[PDB]
Design a protein around this ligand. Structure first.
Ligand SMILES: [Zn+2]
Lengths: 201, 510
């Protein structure tokens, strides 16, 4: 029933508190330098005049060392996906009971800081699995093909929006977090205007 | 009057930069139906921000119930909108208004909308709401300091509830807690305090505030034994007696009993339930058009389980309940269940037999596993009184022979419904699948296959269902070698098809 798949990774998770999309994943430098090795070898044999031994040495040398050429090749490999936002990948949770424990995201940005070893996930997708920042390691698989990425569309962050209990009700995984709600509470529910008696007098 | 008027779709067709550039005023809002409201700009900005799926469909009518302040209705007399209370902004309220905006477009056209497009528009609207409320709202940040504690602590109604209080359960839970619960619910006392405004907004819980601003009452031991003398102080003014703090230290001792046998047995329960529930699959939209309508009694406790269900009323064709009927509380209503309808698929059902829950399920989704999943998440949340006994009771009912073998499944459904819904919130459309998964036609001829008319209703054991049907699914359960050395498995009978059948043979098409 399958075990120990290839083109995979396993790392701890952080959040993205930014203006972004609901399906965006940020792979760090050390994970992205080893998960995309033959892609970097193809880009270094195509754009530059290098053999596969020199390309393998350039890939394995700059894992714990930042340089501009590998970052530019990562930006090119992200930009090569024409109908998608990036490379399609799947993301799992180790207790997998519900629908939200297995999702499909897109790699959109490789980090520049070498000390940060964590995959940064969206805020709205934190609720569908029981995933917190309590030192837990989460798994990731890389879909190679376009047909496989189209077939993995059945598990998506938009698939668990509708509830499986009530007939016409959106489930509670769409609810915002604490500090996201509290600013709107302090903004909207404030003594901002005089009441309706004083306003028309 | 000095109140500007805005239309419904005029604020929706406005730009994102011009939406926040609105003057601070009370204003009239017209809607597509024959009603109009009055509102503040800071509420209709959030209302337009939650109206994102209505922007793609510029022809559907927008009712007056989509606004957060739908209680305010402009009438000819000013007594209905002068001093009234609107709606409280809640994390669930925006999701409910997005759900209303989705089902408004769903019932705009007649029953032909792809629900996955609306489900993607919901998360797109939530993402746009987050990206607009994060950037544009940066000056209004909630805070917490010593002053926020001293503002609520120095209230006289809170300080009166902590002095001259007898150490009694009635004197604490009813007398002492009531005098502070009646002032926490007052909307004209704490205006501007972040703790009370977060309590009224559903973020902070009131059960954790009575143990801090009022008397903490009766912590327990490892066993369920209460103590005679309770702790006098709370959490703001801390506990500093040795006896009271030693009782309080035993309250956190029960939060560490997390042995691995519980996490093993809930995974064993999920593996036992889903492997037998995975037989029924691939529901189809439409109508099978049968007059073999079953009949079930509806009570008060299981009325939420009959929310999305089609029944047969007098002088009518079909109707769904949706859960607002105070009547039909003691009668026996004729329903339309999966037991006894005729579809050409040998393992599928229709949309009208399953109910209104099927449109919330995507097209390429197994309806068999999600019933056991919807049971198991509530069971695990009840696990995380004696929920393991409830889990073993559901195992003995569903996957054993502890039920009396009835002649027809129409009397087996309400017993399982009143056993499940009294403690676990579960819809009856999942219980119908969990009962139908144990149904076998022609048990005297060993024809281990699901019957399409459910009027037969012949039930057997769980292990005989696991071994004598679909050996590729039998290789996934425990005791794999017992279906191998069986003489009944070496003859070509017409049987069902498990999804695991492709992983057993490697992935061959035939
Ligand atoms: Zn049917």
């Amino acid at each position: 029933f399958g075990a120990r798949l290839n083109a995979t990774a396993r790392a701890v998770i952080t959040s993205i508190s930014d203006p972004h999309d609901y399906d965006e994943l940020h792979i760090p430098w050390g994970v992205g330098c080893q998960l995309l090795k033959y892609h970097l070898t193809n880009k270094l044999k195509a754009k530059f005049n290098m053999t596969t031994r020199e390309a393998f040495s350039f890939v394995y040398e700059n894992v714990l060392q930042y340089n501009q050429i590998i970052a530019d090749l990562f930006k090119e490999l992200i930009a090569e996906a024409a109908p998608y936002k990036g490379m399609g990948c799947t993301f799992h949770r180790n207790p997998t009971l519900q629908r939200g424990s297995t999702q499909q995201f897109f790699i959109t940005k490789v980090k520049d800081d070498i000390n940060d070893n964590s995959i940064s996930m969206s805020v709205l997708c934190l609720k569908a699995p029981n995933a917190d920042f309590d030192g837990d390691q989460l798994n990731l698989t890389l879909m190679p093909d376009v047909y496989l990425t189209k077939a993995t569309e059945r598990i998506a962050p938009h698939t668990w929006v509708l509830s499986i209990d009530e007939p016409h009700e959106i489930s509670g995984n769409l609810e915002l977090q604490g500090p996201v709600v509290e600013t709107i509470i302090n903004w909207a529910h404030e003594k901002y205007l005089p009441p309706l008696e004083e306003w028309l007098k | 009057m000095n109140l500007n008027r805005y239309k419904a779709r005029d604020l929706l067709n406005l730009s994102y930069d011009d939406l926040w550039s609105l003057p601070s005023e009370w204003h009239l809002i017209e809607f597509d139906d024959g009603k109009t409201v009055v509102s503040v700009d800071r509420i209709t900005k959030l209302s337009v921000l939650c109206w994102y799926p209505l922007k793609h469909y510029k022809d559907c009518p927008i009712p007056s119930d989509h606004h957060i302040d739908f209680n305010r209705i402009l009438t000819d007399n000013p007594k209905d909108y002068l001093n009234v209370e609107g709606g409280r902004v809640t994390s669930k309220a925006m999701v409910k208004h997005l759900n209303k905006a989705i089902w408004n477009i769903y019932d705009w056209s007649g029953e032909t909308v792809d629900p996955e497009v609306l489900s993607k528009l919901a998360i797109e609207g939530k993402n746009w709401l987050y990206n607009q409320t994060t950037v544009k709202l940066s000056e209004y940040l909630a805070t917490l300091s010593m002053f926020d504690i001293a503002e609520v602590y120095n209230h006289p109604k809170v300080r009166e509830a902590n002095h001259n209080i007898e150490p009694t359960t009635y004197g604490i839970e009813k007398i002492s807690y009531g005098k502070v619960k009646e002032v926490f619910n007052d909307p004209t006392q704490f205006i501007g305090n972040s703790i009370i405004e977060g309590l009224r907004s559903g973020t902070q819980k009131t059960e954790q505030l009575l143990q801090a601003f009022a008397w903490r009452g009766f912590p327990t031991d490892i066993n369920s034994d209460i103590f005679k003398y309770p702790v006098t102080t709370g959490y703001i003014d801390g506990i500093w007696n040795l006896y009271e703090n030693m009782i309080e230290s035993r309250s956190g001792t029960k939060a560490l009993l997390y042995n691995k046998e519980l996490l093993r047995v809930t995974e064993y329960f999920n593996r036992k339930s889903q492997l037998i529930a995975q037989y029924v699959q691939r529901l189809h939209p439409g109508d099978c058009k049968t007059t073999i309508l079953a009949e079930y009694p509806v009570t008060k406790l299981t009325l939420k389980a009959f929310k999305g269900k089609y029944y047969q009323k007098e002088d009518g064709k079909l109707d769904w309940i949706r859960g607002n009927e105070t009547h039909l509380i003691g009668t026996k209503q004729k329903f339309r269940s999966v037991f006894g309808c005729n579809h050409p698929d040998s393992q599928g059902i229709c949309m009208t037999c399953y109910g209104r829950l099927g449109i919330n399920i995507p097209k390429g989704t197994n309806i068999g596993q999600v019933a056991a999943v919807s049971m198991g998440d509530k069971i695990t949340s009840a696990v995380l009184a004696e929920a393991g006994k409830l889990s073993t009771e559901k195992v003995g009912y569903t996957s054993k022979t502890y039920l009396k073998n009835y002649k027809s499944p129409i009397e087996a459904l309400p017993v399982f419904a009143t056993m499940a819904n009294e403690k676990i919130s579960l819809n009856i459309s999942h219980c119908e699948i969990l009962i139908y998964a144990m149904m076998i036609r022609s048990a005297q001829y060993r024809d281990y296959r699901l019957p399409k008319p459910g009027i037969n209703g012949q039930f057997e054991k769980y292990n005989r269902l696991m071994q004598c049907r679909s050996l590729g699914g039998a290789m996934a359960f425990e005791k794999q070698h017992e279906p191998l050395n069986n003489p009944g498995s070496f003859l070509n009978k017409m049987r069902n098809d498990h999804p695991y059948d492709l992983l057993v043979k490697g992935g061959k098409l035939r």
